[PDB]
Write a protein that binds this ligand. Structure first.
Ligand SMILES: CCCCCCCCCCCCO[C@@H]1O[C@H](CO)[C@@H](O[C@H]2O[C@H](CO)[C@@H](O)[C@H](O)[C@H]2O)[C@H](O)[C@H]1O
Ligand SMILES: CCCCCCCCCCCCO[C@@H]1O[C@H](CO)[C@@H](O[C@H]2O[C@H](CO)[C@@H](O)[C@H](O)[C@H]2O)[C@H](O)[C@H]1O
Ligand SMILES: CCCCCCCCCCCCO[C@@H]1O[C@H](CO)[C@@H](O[C@H]2O[C@H](CO)[C@@H](O)[C@H](O)[C@H]2O)[C@H](O)[C@H]1O
Ligand SMILES: CCCCCCCCCCCC
Ligand SMILES: CCCCCCCC
Lengths: 49, 48, 48, 48
């Protein structure tokens, strides 16, 4: 594999650009936050007398 | 590691300048010349 | 209707780029992929 | 026949640009939609 891409630098460049392109498109549609969901979920029962 | 096996070797084959036998950057001019002499000297110290 | 619209030119623009890149890898040439990609209008004209 | 076309070269590049302008014209003329209304064998009538 190393020898393969030594003689074929355009193939090597193509793989990189496709990875960079896919990453660029990801950055547009990814959510943004301080943290992910890290708190455990809670359910509250409320009642009145 | 995938970049180092695919892209990095392809760039080393094409876009690197030749370095002649013996040259370890010791005859460079300015700060880099000092650094290479210092480092090659420190490598000898380290190995010993 | 208001939540987004006219997003096909964006996805087909990248589709052209990725086809150019795949062809470029196939032949090992930045130029040769154009000889394939110039046949796209030959199919579209008959459809229309 | 193809051998004769390659001697011309530049004449078919002009003919190609006619096909692309024809393609461009027919694409803008042709009005778009999503999916055709099919004859499903049933329909309804409102009375208000
Ligand atoms: C065998 C090859 C597989 C390689 C896998 C690695 C590549 C990953 C895909 C390309 C990443 C970039 O493209 C990214 O893809 C994910 C797919 O979950 C999209 O995420 C999508 O999730 C769901 C479908 O699962 C959709 O309802 C949603 O509209 C969309 O956001 C991102 O919006 C997009 O930006
Ligand atoms: C190589 C250096 C790497 C540096 C990496 C640093 C990345 C940090 C990114 C975090 C902030 C991303 O913030 C994100 O920006 C993109 C635009 O770029 C926004 O994207 C939004 O605007 C663009 C237009 O500008 C619309 O096409 C898109 O549909 C819409 O979702 C996201 O709504 C926002 O959440
Ligand atoms: C513990 C604190 C850190 C030490 C700070 C005080 C410095 C004490 C001396 C240690 C060496 C410092 O490193 C200093 O780097 C400069 C880089 O321009 C060297 O200078 C080097 O570059 C110049 C610039 O053209 C050349 O002309 C020169 O021949 C070459 O030696 C100095 O020779 C060296 O004195
Ligand atoms: C071996 C070919 C030398 C030319 C390198 C082309 C670099 C393309 C950069 C693309 C940036 C997204
Ligand atoms: C030792 C030969 C391996 C070649 C792998 C090439 C596929 C990218």
């Amino acid at each position: 594999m190393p020898n393969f891409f030594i003689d074929r630098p355009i193939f090597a460049w193509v793989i990189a650009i496709i990875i960079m392109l896919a990453g660029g498109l990801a950055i547009l549609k990814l959510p943004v936050a301080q943290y992910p969901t890290i708190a455990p979920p809670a359910v509250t029962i409320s009642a009145s007398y | 590691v995938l970049v180092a096996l695919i892209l990095t070797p392809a760039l080393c084959a094409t876009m690197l300048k030749p370095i002649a036998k013996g040259d370890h950057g010791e005859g460079k001019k300015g700060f880099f010349g000092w650094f290479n002499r210092m480092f090659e000297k420190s490598t000898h110290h380290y190995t010993d | 209707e208001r939540l987004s619209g006219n997003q096909a030119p964006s996805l087909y623009a990248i589709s052209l780029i990725v086809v150019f890149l795949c062809l470029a890898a196939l032949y090992e040439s930045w130029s040769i992929p154009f000889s394939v990609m110039l046949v796209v209008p030959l199919g579209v004209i008959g459809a229309l | 026949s193809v051998g004769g076309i390659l001697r011309s070269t530049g004449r078919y590049l002009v003919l190609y640009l006619i096909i692309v302008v024809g393609m461009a014209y027919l694409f803008v003329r042709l009005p778009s939609s999503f999916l055709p209304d099919e004859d499903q064998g049933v329909f309804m009538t409102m009375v208000q």
